[PDB]
Amino acid sequence: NYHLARRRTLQVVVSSLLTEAGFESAEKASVETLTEMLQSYISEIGRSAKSYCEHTARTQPTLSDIVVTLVEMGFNVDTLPAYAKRSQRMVIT
Amino acid sequence: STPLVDFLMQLEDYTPTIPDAVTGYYLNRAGFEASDPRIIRLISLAAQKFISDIANDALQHCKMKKYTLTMEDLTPALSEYGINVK
Ligand SMILES: [Cl-]
């Protein structure tokens, strides 16, 4: 089913992120926590972005809109470019 | 100079660890939708970093005693993300 597939995908994502952070193992509870926090954060961005973009006169959301949304959420966008370069090296296994 | 817009432009090049479809699903679930796939990728990377920051925070705790993430180390890293404090 689709929910299973998503959960498995996020598990692998979290696994990759933990491996990159320097962890070799993890308690099941910690993986479950971060899997939950990951999907919920994406949804939170969605709500925030929805709320924000409803103020613009343009039908289509822009990248600029999303950057501002992240700032509104207190996300430090200044650090993203550096992070994106590392992530590109990252591998799933 | 311009390290941010340089990043935004080549979003089409990056392939985040989170598939676009999965990020898309959770965004569309919050009622947000975007045709520009760079928007999806930006959000995927922000979400990834959100978790990476927590993982790094946890590791720093684990270094205060080859590395195992435990709830003992992860719990303190969640202090800003609990109940809404007024
Ligand atoms: Cl779900």
Residue numbers in the entry:
A (entry chain B): 28 to 120
B (entry chain A): 113 to 177, 192 to 212
Question: What does the published report state?
Answer:
Canonical human TFIID consists of TBP and 13 TBP-associated factors (TAFs). Among these HFD pairs, the TAF8–10 heterodimer plays a key role in the TFIID assembly pathway, is critical for the integrity of holo–TFIID and also fulfills essential functions in early embryonic development. By immunoprecipitating TAF-containing complexes from different cellular compartments, we identify a novel endogenous TFIID subcomplex formed by TAF2, 8 and 10 in the cytoplasm of human cells. Taken together, our data suggest the presence of a nuclear import particle in which the TAF2–8–10 complex is bound by the major binding site of Importin α1 via the NLS of TAF8, poised to shuttle into the nucleus.
A complex of TAF8–10 comprising TAF8 residues 25–120 and TAF10 residues 112–212 yielded crystals, which diffracted incident X-rays to 1.9 Å resolution. We determined the structure of this complex by the Sulfur-SAD method and refined the model to a crystallographic R value of 20.5% and a free R factor of 23.7% with excellent stereochemistry. The final model includes TAF8 residues 28–120 and TAF10 residues 113–212 with the exception of a flexible loop in TAF10 comprising residues 178–191. In our structure, TAF8 wraps entirely around the α2 helix of TAF10 markedly enveloping its interaction partner. Complex formation buries 2212.3 Å2 with predominantly hydrophobic intermolecular contacts. As observed in other HFD interactions, the two opposing aromatic residues Y68 of TAF8 and F162 of TAF10 at the crossover of the α2 helices contact each other via hydrophobic stacking interactions and categorize the complex to the H3/H4 family of HFD-containing proteins. The additional N-terminal α-helix of TAF10, αN and the C-terminal α-helix of TAF8, αC, contact each other on one side of the HFD in a head-to-tail fashion and significantly stabilize the complex by hydrophobic interactions centred on F119 of TAF10. In both proteins, a phenylalanine of loop L1 (F50 in TAF8 and F144 in TAF10) is embedded in a composite, hydrophobic cavity mainly formed by residues from helices α1/α2 of one protomer and helices α2/α3 of the other. The pseudosymmetric L1 loops are characteristic for the TAF8–10 complex, since similar arrangements cannot be found in the crystal structures of the Drosophila TAF6–TAF9 and the human TAF4–TAF12 complex suggesting that the overall shape and precise geometry of the complex is important for integration into core–TFIID.
